[PDB]
Design a protein around this ligand. Structure first.
Ligand SMILES: O=C(O)CCC(=O)C(=O)O
Ligand SMILES: O=C(O)CCC(=O)C(=O)O
Ligand SMILES: [Mn+2]
Ligand SMILES: [Mn+2]
Lengths: 415, 415
């Protein structure tokens, strides 16, 4: 029997015509998260409640409902229950949810729980905005020049988990087929060879890129850059870029800039000419360091998005405070983007900034922009005040060391 | 008939027992390179000749022999001759060669010429050392903490070019096979879907990792880090890491550090305990910025190596002066690692640092360490003297702007 308790006071968010109908008392499912989730989640709940209370003068209030996934799920439902069917059902049913870091066990043949949540709920958009918060200790000279929003495709690519182990009967079978029936000759060593499949479809590419362009329009952003490795992988990465440009032309009236290949899409609200361009992935990893100001909205495939998001987070000193969201047509799951750091679990020491900023994204997604704005304001003030957790403090001089919970309070105090 | 002229004075380098027998007058094949290759190659030839002349007091002298690949090949041999069979033969025959940047044409269905050279000559090691040269304008605060050597697997991975176009009969065939015979269910959108294959074998992984560990030993390096995405791709990237550790144990007496998974390999010459460790690729892209001093020799797959090498080059301000080598058991091809920048071709303006430093690697590979040391010394002095090309100069104050050829002279002057 389920151990999830539906809040007595609270109402389910609904979806109508692609628009969320959020009540003043929405029930929001939340997954504590493994390791440090025990530290960061309480801080997030308190910070969000304060922002909501302050923004709407007590008129609105979230009814938090704990659901399970990960190590805590096994402890609540038993041995092999890492991801309960009800969790997938509840997230879909309640439309909006948030979670702390999750870890996948090894030895049992189970694949990434984070990816499982994304694929099973068809949350095809991994949204990762990366900006700099003044006062944050950064390894680069000008982190303030970084203000990007990453639209990472979440349902395809090698990240889809389609592969076979070297020497397995399946691997031999696939390799045999490829060589004998497909005439593949580029497999350097066919024996003791692992094989993975990388899929990329037109519908997959277009729904991701459509969301990216719509975001640029809605937020009056300057450009959308299709990042890919099409020079090497023409049929997957290359097709992604091709379909991205095609979508811009076919659905957003994209016009040619100069002799190509860049396009300009007129923002139907501001009249701003949004530039649609593309950069080879490896070169892009250099350009984010060398010319960050030239980039804004980024649209890319699963793996590249994972790399780009992490690299960007690192350079702005946001490795531990990078917000993230997994959005689909029916529901959305916001999440802390860092690991579980089990060594510090329960020490009330880690930075709750990531999950808090992800809650900021959640609030904005629900249409509660005032509360979201309050969290952004609190984070900016706390960081600028140099009242921070150990991860920031250790890289700074003249900073006040704060516990995880205390930093949560600092954010509230700066709202 | 061939238009390659074998130098009258000069002798072929030979290979015996895995050791190169280099004469005092070795014939070295060289490919000018497209675009700026017309600028950087002459500078390289002059710099190398000066280093050789100075190091060995006129006793040794390279007999340069021009061979063709790329745009210049089509002009020398005709319309469709992008990569002549003789070029592959000559490089193998002469054992050591160098080349300027190469570009692959689009529209003719031809794949990367750089990859073609690597795969066809089985140059399985892409060696990319990345260090900082004092005085180089860098986007990071402490580029001097970067001193790494990248061992990128060069014959496998998605980089192998095994793929089929969306809607092609072949793609449909493969997808059908995967779904109906392999029972694959993770292909989100089977229609209008491009497909790529990612292979990774035990022999491929081990020969790359073997070279990496041997390099750490020969150069008394502190550690070898296996970089991979095994948490997501268990059978390719994960297997790579597994085989890498296994090789360390089976062939280099690797011992367990603490409770694992790190290993220590005793350097048989210095007694130094070389640490063998591993880091997930996305996290590694963050760690190179946050904790560069903790890394040294890196062993990774093709694609990850491409990303890591470019990211590292960018952070030390070496985007245009990053050396590179493609090494196999029978021959080796050193190369400028940047693009062709056709806009500046012939303007004697671009930085010849990349191809020159690659020539430094070449000289060292031939056992001519004195000459190689002279080039390193010249580069360090020229850069530190602030007498540099536009790409450096534009990011600095109080620097003397030099043409490509002039920077070549500056290097010589600082030898
Ligand atoms: O894949 C996982 O298990 C963790 C989530 C992750 O690192 C990501 O894809 O960014
Ligand atoms: O692949 C090419 O054509 C250029 C060489 C390259 O960028 C590389 O693999 O680093
Ligand atoms: Mn990640
Ligand atoms: Mn490259």
């Amino acid at each position: 029997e389920s151990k999830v308790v539906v809040p007595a006071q609270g109402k389910k968010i609904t979806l109508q015509n692609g628009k969320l109908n959020v009540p003043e008392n929405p029930i929001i499912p939340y997954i504590e998260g493994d390791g440090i989730g025990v530290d960061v989640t309480p801080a997030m709940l308190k910070v969000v409640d304060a922002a909501v209370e302050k923004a709407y003068k007590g008129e609105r209030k979230i009814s938090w409902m704990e659901i399970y996934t990960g190590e805590k799920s096994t402890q609540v439902y038993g041995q092999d229950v890492w991801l309960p069917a009800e969790t997938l059902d509840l997230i879909r049913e309640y439309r909006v949810a948030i979670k702390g870091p999750l870890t996948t066990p090894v030895g049992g043949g189970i694949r990434s729980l984070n990816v499982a949540l994304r694929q099973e709920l068809d949350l095809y958009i991994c949204l990762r905005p990366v900006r700099y918060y003044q006062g944050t200790p950064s390894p680069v000279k000008h982190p303030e020049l970084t203000d990007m929003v990453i639209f990472r495709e979440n349902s395809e690519d090698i990240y889809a988990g389609i592969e076979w182990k070297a020497d397995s009967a399946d691997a031999e079978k696939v390799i045999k087929f490829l060589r004998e029936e497909m005439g593949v000759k580029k497999i350097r060593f066919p024996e003791h060879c692992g094989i993975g499949i990388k899929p990329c479809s037109e519908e997959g590419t277009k729904r991701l890129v459509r969301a990216a362009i719509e975001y640029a329009i809605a937020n009056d952003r300057d450009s959308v850059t299709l990042v890919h490795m099409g020079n090497i992988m023409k049929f997957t990465e290359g097709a992604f870029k091709d379909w991205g440009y095609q979508l811009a032309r076919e659905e957003f009236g994209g016009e040619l800039i100069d002799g190509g290949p860049w396009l300009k899409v007129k923002n139907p609200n501001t009249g701003k000419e949004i530039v649609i361009k593309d950069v080879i992935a490896d070169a892009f990893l250099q350009q984010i360091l060398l010319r960050p100001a030239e980039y804004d909205v980024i649209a890319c495939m699963n793996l590249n998005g994972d790399y780009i998001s992490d690299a960007l987070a690192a350079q702005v000193g946001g490795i531990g405070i990078a917000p993230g969201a997994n959005i689909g047509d029916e529901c959305a799951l916001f999440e802390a983007t860092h690991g579980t750091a089990p060594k510090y679990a329960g020490q009330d020491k880690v930075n709750p900034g990531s999950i808090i900023l992800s809650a900021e994204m959640m609030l904005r997604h629900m249409g509660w922009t005032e509360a979201a704005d309050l969290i952004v304001k609190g984070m900016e003030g706390a960081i600028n005040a140099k009242t921070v957790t150990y991860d920031f403090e250790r890289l700074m001089d003249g900073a006040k060391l704060l516990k995880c919970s205390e930093f949560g309070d600092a954010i509230i105090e700066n709202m």
